[PDB]
């Protein structure tokens, strides 16, 4: 009697927990990525201006 009830409880809260945790991640990671993606761009640009002043002046 006792077994099947406890098996369903375990599986039930599991699919809950995992689904909300999976959800929380996809937002945050991607907000993540957006940080970086702009960054990786914009970085090289300033620099190129920067070094270019070097290069041409020399």
């Amino acid at each position: 009697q006792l077994e099947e009830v406890k098996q369903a409880s375990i599986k039930q809260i599991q699919d809950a927990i995992d689904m909300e945790k999976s959800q929380q991640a996809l937002v945050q990671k991607r907000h993540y990525l957006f940080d970086v993606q702009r960054n990786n761009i914009a970085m090289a640009l300033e620099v190129t201006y920067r070094e270019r002043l070097h290069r041409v002046y020399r």
Partner: protein, 66 residues
């Protein structure tokens, strides 16, 4: 520039005898001119080459993005 007055009279006036003429500064000296022309071009070759009486303005660029 330096000293002894009888010898230097021979030379110090001869510093400026050269300078005391300036179209061929009592001698520019054809040899001086020839090797000058050699070294001045050769110097130019030994240099960077982007004309030295011109301003190298800027350039622009666009970096790798995916």
């Amino acid at each position: 520039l330096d000293p002894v007055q009888k010898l230097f009279v021979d030379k110090i006036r001869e510093y400026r005898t050269k300078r005391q003429t300036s179209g061929g500064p009592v001698d520019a000296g054809p040899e001086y001119q020839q090797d000058l022309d050699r070294e001045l071009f050769k110097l130019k070759q030994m240099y960077g080459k982007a004309d030295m009486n011109t301003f190298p303005n800027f350039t622009f660029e666009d970096p790798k993005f995916e």
